[PDB]
Design a protein around this ligand. Structure first.
Ligand code: NAG
Ligand code: NAG
Ligand code: NAG
Ligand code: NAG
Ligand code: NAG
Ligand code: NAG
Ligand code: NAG
Ligand code: NAG
Ligand code: NAG
Ligand code: NAG
Ligand code: NAG
Ligand code: NAG
Ligand code: NAG
Lengths: 88, 411, 162, 48, 39, 193
């Protein structure tokens, strides 16, 4: 992971100050599971506390993400998609 | 049992002793800090008694004590002494410690460097009263003390400032440390060159070594950290539903909100009491340091102190005071033996059956002849009746050698 | 970002809605109120020093110093030995009125230094100086059980839990 | 109003000071003395 | 932060959506990385 | 010190009149009309406030006692080095050269009357580090060389008493070619007559 996964903890603005906060963060230099879209691939992963998603691509293969408990018509599910018009 | 080491040579060493004299005169308002712009918390706070008056008075007492500390350490002179426009000090150079006219603050390069080295806001209920004596005024006091010690020696401390040439004052100080004044006069150029070299080196050391002013930086940091923690404790719930008073007052009815407001009020009162206690202890430590600094200014700057290591390592010659933010830096000029030589030694000289003991200094033998020299400098002199006194005979003193005591009257 | 915070947990800036601009929030002026008084015997006339606050906002004689502003004391230019400590090098009664002036550090004198001249006292004065030092304080004793719990057992039982 | 009342040895109120009348009266009230000595005295807090 | 939405429902599973390139599907050469947030 | 102790005691007794959030400051009065389940919590609040006030008073007394101990240690050192003996340290026992001091008892304190010597009626003199005589440099054994404008004299630095330069109040070291600022004068040898 190197030094990635840091996000602004809040909408609070701070200038030239060091701030210490305890939130859900991706640990530095941690092992991150990486997958290649091409097969010579989108497995279903658990969500747990949070997910840091990194994308290295040029043709925008990764268009969206799906979140939920059962991932089927049985239960309510969250769906973010990019249909080349807008994020829905 | 018969060997001695006499310093044939010496050196002049200038050492800085940095002592805090005062802390920032912080003042808290218990009512505003604990109960912010609300009547409801104020009514409950009034049920806790005179805690806010006691805390405010304690902080006022520490602030007055800081002013008294600065006044005691620096204002030891009835008059403001001015250095002569011509720096004819017999080769001694005080440019690094005398105030510089070109600078827009009448501060010497050394104190200006000290101010530049140490590096340091509006809060709710918290204010910093300015010091009674300004930095410029404290620097003027230090300059007056420095002019007084440079021109009148230690006389200005005792009473009226009596002018005395600086080489002659240095000779008196050398006599004060047990070295005959002729040693300075024979080595005035060497001593002046050493003094200037040490004065340059000490400014270089202050400019090059960090943490030299760390004692002064530490008290400023401790005061700032205590203030920062006290402000940070405003955001602590202390078991209340929310830290901010307005939210708990707005979302809860007063019959139930009173217990939450009480939890916040007691927590803030306890935090302020802890901060005041920490400040009181820190002020006591600062007062002890200021009392030590005042004593050091009285005995090392206003006078020559025979207390060992009280005014710097080595035989103390003099001290130069320098102002610093919330502190004083003492430049102790001291005499240190440099080159040591062995000498065969006898407690007394046996002449014609009589035992002679040195009036001052010790007997020395370079290996062929015996001589009488001062202990702190090797200046051998022929044994005579004017520098030695006769006591008893040679059959009582243990470990004595025979020699000829030249009587000046005899030839 | 919608609002900014200082190094401490206090809000320094906000993003104002309805205009999308940044407004700095400064705690509005407050300060202690000190009263310069020469003493009831000397005069009933007193001056008010508002501490650490500008006084372009709340007026017969106003003098602004780093310690806040003094009202009712006139500022003179000639310095004097400090009579009342105000702060920031300022001190304050003369000519039946309260005056404010920069402190005078003492009588400025230059010693006539010369490389071949010495001043030697032809006489002396034997002075006596009084130094007062406290050596002890009242030996006050307070009994907790009587002080916090007056002549009652149940408060003593509650105290024993402490 | 807050009032500082001077009781004589017989309990008669011989004098009074109104703490809100003027800054000198506030100084007398804060020191709890009808007579104040020379010096600075913090009596209140100005808050806008 | 780019989106904040009051969804209100628990999320225990996550699945990414990929753009399948028609030749029978051959996805583009890309790398997607998943890192789990920890307290 | 007396006022601070009395003021601390006055605050401590006045703190009893505070409620600390109780229905009343009087312990028995709230105890007499409240049942033990709710009287206990009211008494607990009163005890917490009063105990905190007592702890604060004890802490303030401890700090004041430490300051009084520091003052007493300084007073003991002054009694030893100013009254029991003579102190050479400047300003420890009063302005001026310290001659002696007298202790006086006082309520909770001691007053030291420091008897000190202060120079006065000083006069200008032309000074010289050394005197050249017969090719030899003479330095004052004790005191300094001073000229009133016609003659040179040796005098103690702290009091003007002119004495003729002789071989017993001056010592010879080196030659006149090494001393800076040396002057020429006659050293009256007592053996010469
Ligand atoms: C004494 O030491 C200094 C500095 O080391 C030197 O300059 C001087 O020549 C020495 N003098 C003698 C007499 O050795
Ligand atoms: C003292 O040293 C400084 C170093 O910059 C020099 O400028 C000054 O001329 C010196 N003073 C004398 C009297 O030589
Ligand atoms: C002479 O002095 C030197 C140091 O300068 C020392 O090492 C040596 O032991 C001494 N010898 C005697 C006999 O004093
Ligand atoms: C010792 O002193 C004598 C007399 O000053 C001198 O002649 C001799 O050369 C010296 N000897 C040594 C070993 O230094
Ligand atoms: C020193 O001790 C030696 C024995 O090691 C002895 O011969 C000599 O007399 C002693 N000298 C003195 C001055 O005591
Ligand atoms: C010194 O002289 C005495 C007699 O005057 C003699 O007994 C003694 O041995 C001599 N000592 C030395 C060290 O020459
Ligand atoms: C105080 O008021 C003066 C005059 O308007 C102004 O120049 C100055 O900046 C003000 N200072 C502060 C701290 O508000
Ligand atoms: C010294 O001063 C005293 C007064 O303090 C005076 O009585 C005395 O005559 C003076 N003596 C001389 C020598 O001036
Ligand atoms: C107080 O009452 C007594 C009666 O014993 C009377 O003598 C005195 O004058 C009264 N003093 C005052 C001040 O009222
Ligand atoms: C010494 O002379 C100078 C100038 O002539 C003068 O300023 C000073 O007051 C004189 N001091 C005494 C003690 O006479
Ligand atoms: C200096 O003192 C000597 C002492 O004999 C005296 O003769 C002479 O007149 C004095 N001169 C002045 C100027 O006082
Ligand atoms: C003092 O300085 C002057 C020049 O200002 C010089 O003529 C005189 O010789 C010097 N005297 C001494 C004692 O240094
Ligand atoms: C003192 O006398 C020597 C010659 O004896 C002479 O060279 C020198 O200039 C004289 N110095 C003074 C101060 O008169």
């Amino acid at each position: 992971s190197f030094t990635r996964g840091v996000y602004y903890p809040d909408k609070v603005f701070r200038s030239s100050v060091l701030h210490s906060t305890q939130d859900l963060f991706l640990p530095f230099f941690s092992n991150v599971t990486w997958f290649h879209a091409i097969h010579v691939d989108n497995p279903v992963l658990p969500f747990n506390d949070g997910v840091y998603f990194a994308s290295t691509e040029k043709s925008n293969i990764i268009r969206g993400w799906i979140f939920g408990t059962t991932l089927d018509s049985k239960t309510q599910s969250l769906l973010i998609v990019n249909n080349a018009t807008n994020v829905v | 049992n018969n060997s001695i080491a006499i310093p044939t040579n010496f050196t002049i060493s200038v050492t800085t002793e940095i002592l805090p004299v005062s802390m920032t005169k912080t003042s808290v308002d218990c009512t505003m800090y604990i109960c912010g712009d609300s009547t409801e918390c104020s009514n409950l706070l009034l049920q806790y008694g005179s805690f806010c008056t006691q805390l405010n008075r304690a902080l006022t007492g520490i602030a007055v004590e800081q002013d008294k500390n600065t006044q005691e350490v620096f204002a030891q002179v009835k008059q403001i002494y001015k250095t002569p426009p011509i720096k004819d000090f017999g080769g001694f150079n005080f440019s690094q410690i005398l105030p510089d006219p070109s600078k827009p603050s009448k501060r010497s390069p050394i104190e200006d460097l000290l101010f530049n080295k140490v590096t340091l806001q509006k809060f709710n209920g918290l204010t910093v009263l300015p010091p009674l004596l300004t930095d410029e005024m404290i620097a003027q006091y230090t300059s007056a003390l420095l002019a007084g010690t440079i021109t009148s020696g230690w006389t200005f401390g005792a009473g009226p400032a009596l002018q005395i040439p600086f080489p002659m004052q240095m000779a008196y100080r050398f006599n004060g440390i047990g070295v005959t004044q002729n040693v300075l006069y024979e080595n005035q150029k060497l001593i002046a060159n050493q003094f200037n070299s040490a004065i340059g080196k000490i400014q270089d050391s202050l400019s090059s070594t960090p943490s030299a002013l760390g004692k002064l930086q530490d008290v400023v940091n401790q005061n700032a950290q205590a203030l920062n923690t006290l402000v940070k404790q405003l955001s602590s719930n202390f078991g209340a539903i929310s830290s901010v008073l307005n939210d708990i007052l707005s979302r809860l009815d007063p019959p139930e909100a009173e217990v939450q407001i009480d939890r916040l009020i007691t927590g803030r009162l306890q935090s302020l009491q802890t901060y005041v206690t920490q400040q009181l202890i820190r002020a006591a430590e600062i007062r002890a340091s200021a009392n030590l600094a005042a004593t050091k200014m009285s005995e090392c700057v206003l006078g020559q102190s025979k207390r060992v290591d009280f005014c710097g390592k080595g035989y103390h010659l003099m001290s130069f005071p320098q102002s610093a933010p919330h502190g004083v830096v003492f430049l102790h000029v001291t005499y240190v033996p440099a080159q040591e030589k062995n000498f065969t030694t006898a407690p007394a000289i046996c002449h014609d059956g009589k035992a002679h003991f040195p009036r001052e200094g010790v007997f020395v033998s370079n290996g062929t002849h015996w001589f009488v020299t001062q202990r702190n400098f090797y200046e051998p002199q022929i044994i005579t009746t004017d520098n030695t006194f006769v006591s008893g005979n040679c059959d009582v003193v243990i470990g004595i050698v025979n020699n000829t005591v030249y009587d000046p009257l005899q030839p | 970002q919608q609002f900014g915070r200082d190094i401490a947990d206090t809000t320094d800036a906000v993003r104002d809605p309805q205009t999308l601009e940044i407004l700095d929030i400064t705690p509005c002026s407050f300060g202690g109120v000190s009263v310069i008084t020469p003493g009831t015997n000397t005069s009933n006339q007193v001056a008010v020093l508002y501490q650490d606050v500008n006084c372009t906002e709340v007026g017969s004689n106003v003098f602004q110093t780093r310690a806040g502003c003094l009202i009712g004391a006139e500022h003179v230019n000639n310095s004097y030995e400090c009579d009342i400590p105000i702060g920031a090098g300022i001190c304050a009664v003369a000519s039946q009125s309260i005056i404010a002036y920069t402190m005078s550090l003492g009588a400025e004198n230059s010693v006539a230094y010369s490389n071949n001249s010495i001043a030697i006292p032809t006489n002396f004065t034997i002075s006596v100086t009084t130094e007062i030092l406290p050596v002890s304080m009242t030996k006050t004793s307070v009994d907790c059980t009587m002080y916090i719990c007056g002549d009652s057992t149940e408060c003593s039982n509650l105290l024993l839990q402490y | 109003r807050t009032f500082l009342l001077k009781y004589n040895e017989n309990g008669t109120i011989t004098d009074a000071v109104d703490c809100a009348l003027d800054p000198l009266s506030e100084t007398k009230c804060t020191l709890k003395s009808f007579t104040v000595e020379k010096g600075i005295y913090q009596t209140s807090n100005f808050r806008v | 932060p780019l989106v904040d939405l009051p969804i209100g429902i628990n999320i225990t599973r996550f699945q990414t959506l990929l753009a399948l390139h028609r030749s029978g599907w051959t996805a583009g050469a890309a790398a997607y990385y998943v890192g789990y947030l920890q307290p």
